[PDB]
Design a protein around this nucleic acid. Sequence first.
RNA 1: UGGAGGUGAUUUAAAUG
RNA 2: GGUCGGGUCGAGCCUAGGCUCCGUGAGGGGGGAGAAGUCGUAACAAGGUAGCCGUAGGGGAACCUACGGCUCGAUCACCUCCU
RNA 3: AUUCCGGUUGAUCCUGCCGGAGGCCACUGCUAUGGGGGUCCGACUAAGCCAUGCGAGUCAAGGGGGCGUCCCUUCUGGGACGCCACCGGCGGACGGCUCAGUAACACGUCGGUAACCUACCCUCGGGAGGGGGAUAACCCCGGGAAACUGGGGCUAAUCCCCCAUAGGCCUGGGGUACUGGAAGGUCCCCAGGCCGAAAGGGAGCCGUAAGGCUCCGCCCGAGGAUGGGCCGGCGGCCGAUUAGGUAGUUGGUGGGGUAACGGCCCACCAAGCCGAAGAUCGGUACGGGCCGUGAGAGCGGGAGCCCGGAGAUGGACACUGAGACACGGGUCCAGGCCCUACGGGGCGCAGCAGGCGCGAAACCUCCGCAAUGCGGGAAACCGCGACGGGGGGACCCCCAGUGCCGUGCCUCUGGCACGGCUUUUCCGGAGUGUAAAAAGCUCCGGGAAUAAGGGCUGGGCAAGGCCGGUGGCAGCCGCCGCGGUAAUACCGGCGGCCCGAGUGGUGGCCACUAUUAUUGGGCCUAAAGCGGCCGUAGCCGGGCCCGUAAGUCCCUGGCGAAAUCCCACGGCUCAACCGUGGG
Lengths: 125, 242, 98, 173
Amino acid sequence: AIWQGRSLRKPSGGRIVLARKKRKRELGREPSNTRVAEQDKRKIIRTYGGNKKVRLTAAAYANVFDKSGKGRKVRIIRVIENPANRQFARRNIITKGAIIETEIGKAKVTSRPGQDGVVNAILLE
Amino acid sequence: ARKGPKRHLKRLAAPTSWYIERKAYKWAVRPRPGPHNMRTSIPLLYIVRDYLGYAKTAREARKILNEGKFLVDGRVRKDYKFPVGIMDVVSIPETGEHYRVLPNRIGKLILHPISEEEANIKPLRIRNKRMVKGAKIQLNFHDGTNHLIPLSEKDNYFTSYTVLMKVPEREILEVLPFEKGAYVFVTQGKNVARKGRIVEIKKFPMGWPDVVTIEDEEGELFDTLKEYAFVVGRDKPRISLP
Amino acid sequence: ARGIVLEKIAVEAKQPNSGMRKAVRVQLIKNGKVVTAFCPGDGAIKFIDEHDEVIIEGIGGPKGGSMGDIPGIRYKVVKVNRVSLKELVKGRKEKPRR
Amino acid sequence: GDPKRQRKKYETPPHPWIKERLDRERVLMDKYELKNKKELWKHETQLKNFRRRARRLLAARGKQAEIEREQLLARLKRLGLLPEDAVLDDVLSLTIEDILERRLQTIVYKKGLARTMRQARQLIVHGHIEVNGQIIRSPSYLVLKEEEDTITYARTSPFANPQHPERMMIEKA
RNA sequence: UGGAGGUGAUUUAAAUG
RNA sequence: GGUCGGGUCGAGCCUAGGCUCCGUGAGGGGGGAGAAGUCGUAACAAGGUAGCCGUAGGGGAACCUACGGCUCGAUCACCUCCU
RNA sequence: AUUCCGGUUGAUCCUGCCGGAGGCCACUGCUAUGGGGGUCCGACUAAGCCAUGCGAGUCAAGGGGGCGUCCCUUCUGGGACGCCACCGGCGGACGGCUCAGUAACACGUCGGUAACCUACCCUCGGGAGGGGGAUAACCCCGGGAAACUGGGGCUAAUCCCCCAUAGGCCUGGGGUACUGGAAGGUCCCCAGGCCGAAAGGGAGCCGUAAGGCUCCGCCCGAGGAUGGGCCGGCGGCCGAUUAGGUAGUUGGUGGGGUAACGGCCCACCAAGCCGAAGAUCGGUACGGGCCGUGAGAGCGGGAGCCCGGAGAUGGACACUGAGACACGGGUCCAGGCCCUACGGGGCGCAGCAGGCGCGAAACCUCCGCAAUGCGGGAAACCGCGACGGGGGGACCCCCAGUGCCGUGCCUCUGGCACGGCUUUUCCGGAGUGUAAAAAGCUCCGGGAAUAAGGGCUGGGCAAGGCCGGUGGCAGCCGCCGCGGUAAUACCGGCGGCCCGAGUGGUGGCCACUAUUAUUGGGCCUAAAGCGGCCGUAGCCGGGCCCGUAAGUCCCUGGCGAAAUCCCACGGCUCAACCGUGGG
Ligand SMILES: [Mg+2]
Ligand SMILES: [Mg+2]
Ligand SMILES: [Mg+2]
Ligand SMILES: [Mg+2]
Ligand SMILES: [Mg+2]
Ligand SMILES: [Mg+2]
Ligand SMILES: [Mg+2]
Ligand SMILES: [Mg+2]
Ligand SMILES: [Mg+2]
Ligand SMILES: [Mg+2]
Ligand SMILES: [Mg+2]
Ligand SMILES: [Mg+2]
Ligand SMILES: [Mg+2]
Ligand SMILES: [Mg+2]
Ligand SMILES: [Mg+2]
Ligand SMILES: [Mg+2]
Ligand SMILES: [Mg+2]
Ligand SMILES: [Mg+2]
Ligand SMILES: [Mg+2]
Ligand SMILES: [Mg+2]
Ligand SMILES: [Mg+2]
Ligand SMILES: [Mg+2]
Ligand SMILES: [Mg+2]
Ligand SMILES: [Mg+2]
Ligand SMILES: [Mg+2]
Ligand SMILES: [Mg+2]
Ligand SMILES: [Mg+2]
Ligand SMILES: [Mg+2]
Ligand SMILES: [Mg+2]
Ligand SMILES: [Mg+2]
Ligand SMILES: [Mg+2]
Ligand SMILES: [Mg+2]
Ligand SMILES: [Mg+2]
Ligand SMILES: [Mg+2]
Ligand SMILES: [Mg+2]
Ligand SMILES: [Mg+2]
């Protein structure tokens, strides 16, 4: 379905004719559009070589860090902005680099919730 | 290999360091993963059947192995696929003989007879060295094995040094540094199986490997890769070599 | 190649020779094309009949083509109903099914 | 690519009908009682190969060339084609007649074990001749100098009896 | 001895194997 | 695992548009062999009007004529330039 | 052998092409006694279609049962013993087959991963505490034409699920213990989170018992090994009667996704990227080691063996698993086909044999796991159309036979007559050989007995100026040329020549050919100097002095698998073939 193998175009602009079928080790997966919700929800993915990934689909809390090294677990109000996609903020989609507002103020997300399963942010002064 | 690991090996594609008749049969033994690498070792079946001649067929070689008659580095080995490599000791106690595995002047593996006393020690070149949990040091040797030392000893071991180890107890008894005036034995390359003393060491930028100049007994100087030079003594050999 | 005989013909030799060279028109099995083939030997044309199958091969002239006083013919008959024509012309063997 | 194909050990003439070559080869065939042309051609090729190695070694220099140079001389004197003090230039004066004189057929006839070349061939093929204790049935086998004098009747042969009727007729010659 | 150029002229008809 | 909503990906299928290819094809056109049914004699000797190139017009057919060019043109007389 | 010979004229010298003479490959006419060795035999057309049998299993020392023979007692039983299936574990992703697609990071070669995954194996450091659960087998009842498949009862595990601990991953703040050329890596201390182990199981003895003493095992962490993924530089076809091409296209910023880097995919911002040193498009084709030929420079090919790639009727797409989008496993569409009680259900030999079709073009529906190896098992072992052994075949190469000797006669090469000899080969036996057979090899008895063809005969080109037929008819002819009633050339007889278990025909590549020319060709009259000139890129460029060290030369480290080639020595009787060393 989602193939991540190679481009069908040469850098000169010419076309490429595929010489083999798609291999299983080349496939992607659906993106996790991590939403703000009242409750948390995550799932576990079995991956190449029999490994695991923790995929967060709905987030209600965040771990917020200061410049002094102290962290606090607080709840997420909403997404103020997200430079990754022009309409993520309207839909409350959380990714790395998004600006979120919490009970203790705005913060910038430093984690990849689709890969790690948690939301970590640095508190903005 | 279209979809999975290879498990077979044709005779014509066997490693060049084995003493084997390459056209007599279709198949060769595919060695099992283990201590050494493919270029520096040989399966034990060829030692029992082809080299020593204690068995004529594979079936009776396996019966000899399963009864526990062959020791490698002081430990019983029953797997006929077990890889036996450079500097190992092969022991037969029911006959009272011992050998060290060493490369030829042409790069082929041979058995060198040794004394019963010298059979208790194996020299191990230090391939890598790292920190490990609890802040201890792990030493990774050329035959793939490992050892632990306390943090207070960290200045007595570095890569390319050789450690003489008592087997099978695995107890250290001597450390031989890599420096000028040390005695070395070449294990790979064009100058394989030549031995001598270290004269100079040279280094280069961007990860190209370092090279050593060595003086032999008759007074000739030759170069090789540093990682091909295996320390065996201070100014005289500490093991018996041809 | 193998083919089926459609008719017998005769080709005049080129100047300054004189004589009639006996040949056949053959339709090839593999693609249906029709070609002319020479019948070598004295009296050889008498061993051929319409609807018979023949095996033909090159006549052997320069540049892989025709030869001698018969340009336009590029092939010659070698077998007739799976029997060697050379034998039939000499003897030693008989043409089957009458 | 293509795997190995086993190739002929002899070379054929570049033109089948040249009068002078035909006459020369007919004389050789009659004299040594060879069975066919290819047999003769085989020996010719052997000679050519020897010369081709000498021509290449004269114009060579280095360390492997010397080893090859002495190996060629040693092999040639082991077969009995050169004396013990020959040099490389002497390789270029060898003739086809030198090689044919080393055939087991010829040597059996030269020693006086048969009366004719044809009889020597039949004695070899039927198994009446031993070479250094071994029975060999190939008349074209080239005899080494070290074993030339240990060539006799087989110890199980009818001819190994000085009273055999056919042996007495051979001895009368 | 032998050569290279220029300008003038050319008195009917006459096919074929 | 069934039923419904939404998103998204997708072989196949249908219609139309444009190119491309094979198969037959009334009729038209030169090319090559054959051997002579026919009309003439254009090219070779000054071939009976020297031959040939470019362009243009004309004629059953080879061909003819006009302007400019070449010698890969015979004969005699005179003149010029050389060895 | 670093080669020539015939053909344009009444006769001559040239240019130039055609033919002859050599090697190798595929089909094929006629004809054939023996052995040995080898990497030979449905590749060319149809990656067309396939009846039947076989090509992947194994573990009883993981677990409850069924049944049988026996021992102690037995109302009942406990034991031991031996088969059966089921649950459970590992393997089935290798090996085998073919060359359709592909002009591409597919392949060769040198490097990189500090940007990654890895069941089985090796070393070292640690761990195995507490709970629960169903279900096959088995018994009751069944459905369906079949393929298949339903309900109730009962049961175990090294089966499955929870709790704890160990452990793992992400982010923020400090410290500097390690490797390395260089730390987004390793190690230590605080802090917020999320994920989250295990079978002390099995077998045998010393055990009165208690408990040891071995063997095979279970889980986590660090490193290696093995098998792979990804990336870069460089190298190897034809076409201009294809000149402009590209618009996720090229780069940037912010994310997602992946085992992992990446326009791999998105959102936003720019106008980039390739091209006459040939882009793009079209044609043909799996790449290499190697193979054919030639004095060499070169030219041509790349089925068979080894290494890499791809595919399983065509086109799409998933489940399990360490590894697959899986040839003898699953789904949809398309196209054929088989069985139906008509409701339904199944199958694609480019595995080994075997059949049909296509064609000029290719074998037995055999025997064995004894050897070499692979999977499983603690082991003894078991399975394997891989592999090994034979059967068929003018596949390639090596070594032989179809008689020998003496004395006479002839036309004296050779044939015939006498006298004698031999047994490779042939016929019948014993031994050895073999998994069993067969071949082969050593011996014994019989006996010259059982064994020669194909092409050519005017010149090139070795070999008849003889005889009988035919009469520009029939026929021959690579080329030049013969045949028109007195043919050395057609048909036949007798002679002769070449090669010989082979010898001729047809098609292809190299040579011939200095008719593709770097070595090494031509252009006044023979094919060929643009009608003339100016100039862009490219190629080619005057003398001296100083510097550099890219080209270039010399020395030395790491590489370019094996097989294939050359040499000596050694093992099969020698050889072909095979081994050990040098190149
Ligand atoms: Mg490095
Ligand atoms: Mg190939
Ligand atoms: Mg005229
Ligand atoms: Mg006129
Ligand atoms: Mg005129
Ligand atoms: Mg006019
Ligand atoms: Mg002429
Ligand atoms: Mg030619
Ligand atoms: Mg086929
Ligand atoms: Mg399978
Ligand atoms: Mg496979
Ligand atoms: Mg293309
Ligand atoms: Mg590459
Ligand atoms: Mg390229
Ligand atoms: Mg847990
Ligand atoms: Mg990223
Ligand atoms: Mg193809
Ligand atoms: Mg190719
Ligand atoms: Mg094949
Ligand atoms: Mg098929
Ligand atoms: Mg064939
Ligand atoms: Mg078959
Ligand atoms: Mg095992
Ligand atoms: Mg002659
Ligand atoms: Mg002919
Ligand atoms: Mg006559
Ligand atoms: Mg005749
Ligand atoms: Mg020329
Ligand atoms: Mg000009
Ligand atoms: Mg100019
Ligand atoms: Mg200059
Ligand atoms: Mg340099
Ligand atoms: Mg090699
Ligand atoms: Mg021998
Ligand atoms: Mg030899
Ligand atoms: Mg060999």
